[PDB]
């Protein structure tokens, strides 16, 4: 039931692919939600990528419950922005993740990027970026002039550093390269620092993080027009009875999962078919106790 809690159907798309901007998931841009509905038919059509602590990234973004995104402008010195690959086709032409910028060499040179971007606002800024893992040394040189890459995303509180690992990977969408995605949060008054020499697929900005009631649910259930305070992967249930047997997974004002298939609560007295000591009177109807 959609009415009480704002449902967002993740049709054909995962939550991470929508965040990154898989061309299918363009419709989800800057849309907020109360509960996301990951589908099992959902697939990833874009560049092959893995992301360490995927579950944490997924669970963190779901708790915020919004893909609101404001673009920021970085002066990428002497590098070719908007890098594209045939792996993520877009209608006719080839393209890339909508929220990431593939930085490659410009005129056979890759200068060390030392870029800065502060956070003057009172709320936390979440930047989503990654690193490219070229399949072979030849592909590495072809993309970036220098031979070995180095990426160090820093902030006043913490620092992340990744080294690209070159090697063969199984061809998926005919692309044997890989991409490791990471995330960094920039607290207010803090400042983001990126010093890279290459292999950097830098971001196009930050996602506005709100600490909210939203969550996620893996389900193949359809959605209809109705009002029900509970949502389970099997479907929506009513919150009348205080115990449920449907599913371990709940969302909202829901009864607690019990192994028992049924629990009969007595609402009348002991039924004794035919004074009172021997049996009760079946004929009596207007009341419960009486005189004959």
């Amino acid at each position, epitope marked *: 039931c959609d009415s009480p809690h704002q449902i967002l159907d993740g049709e054909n798309c995962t939550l991470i692919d929508a965040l990154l901007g898989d061309p299918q998931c363009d419709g989800f841009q800057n849309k907020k939600w109360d509960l996301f509905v990951e589908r099992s038919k959902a697939y990833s059509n874009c560049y092959p990528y893995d992301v360490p602590d995927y579950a944490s990234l997924r669970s963190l973004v779901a708790s915020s419950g919004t893909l609101e995104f404001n673009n*920021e*402008s970085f*002066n990428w010195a002497g590098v070719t922005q908007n890098g594209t690959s045939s792996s993520c086709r877009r209608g006719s032409n080839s393209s890339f993740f909508s929220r990431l910028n593939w930085l490659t060499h410009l005129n056979s040179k890759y200068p060390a990027l030392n870029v*800065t*971007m502060p956070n*003057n*606002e*009172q709320f936390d800024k979440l930047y989503i970026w990654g690193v490219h893992h070229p399949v072979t040394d030849k592909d590495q040189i072809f993309l970036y002039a220098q031979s070995s890459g180095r990426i160090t995303v820093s902030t006043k509180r913490s620092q992340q550093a990744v080294i690209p690992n070159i090697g063969s990977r199984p061809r998926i969408r005919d692309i044997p390269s890989r991409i490791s995605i990471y995330w960094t949060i920039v607290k207010p008054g803090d400042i983001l620092l990126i010093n890279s020499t290459g292999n950097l697929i830098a971001p196009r900005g930050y996602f*506005k993080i709100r600490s909210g009631k939203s969550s996620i649910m893996r389900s193949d259930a359809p959605i209809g027009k109705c009002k029900s305070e509970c949502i389970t992967p099997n479907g929506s249930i009513p919150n009348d009875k205080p115990f449920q047997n449907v599913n371990r997974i709940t969302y909202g004002a829901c009864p607690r999962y019990v192994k028992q298939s049924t629990l009969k609560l007595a609402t009348g007295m002991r039924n004794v078919p035919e004074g009172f000591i021997e049996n009760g009177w079946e004929g009596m109807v207007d009341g419960w106790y009486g005189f004959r």
Partner: antibody
Amino acid sequence: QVQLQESGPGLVKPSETLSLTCAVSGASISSFYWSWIRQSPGKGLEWIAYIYYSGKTQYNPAVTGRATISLQNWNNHVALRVNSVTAADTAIYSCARHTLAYHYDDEGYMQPGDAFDLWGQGTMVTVSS
Amino acid sequence: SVLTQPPSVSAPAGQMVTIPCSGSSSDIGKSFVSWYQQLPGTAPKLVIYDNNKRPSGIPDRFSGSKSGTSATLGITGLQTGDEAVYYCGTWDSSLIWVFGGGTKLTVLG
């Protein structure tokens, strides 16, 4: 070492739209509030509008709603278009930076600053035919 | 021009000057103040941000003040290079920026 350089046309036919940009250097355009101010012989020194990457924007009422401030990320420029130009609109047009406000607003964004940090030289626009 | 300031003042080199900036209570009484110097043919420069504070590279020679509806800019020990126009300005009620008329500072001697 942040600088501004206002690129602009020299003349503009009356009742037409006026295109304008100023290039920013050594600083992301999204990091500060920007506003345009224009100086004219007569009619004082006139602020027109301010912008911020949030989308917050205020225009001066004395200039009709014809002015619309944009800002662009690819070229790292902040831009300004004003349609239906009259003869009065002739002036030098400069872009300038606000002092960071150091106190957010409703919904978390930084407010516009109470002072103009630095100015570009500016470009003279002439309303001639 | 909802901010009043005298068109021109004059003083010998090495002396003090006072530029007043009269306004209503809707602007200065509520908001802060800023002073801007525009040397001839150059982009206007900021001289005093907020009420008494001066940016880096602005000598303590320049000094500012506020008092209800009026604001005051002061310069001790004048140089010939200080000949310029000086603008006071601030926000008002409607959050629209207003500058003063202008003050053409001439230095004699």
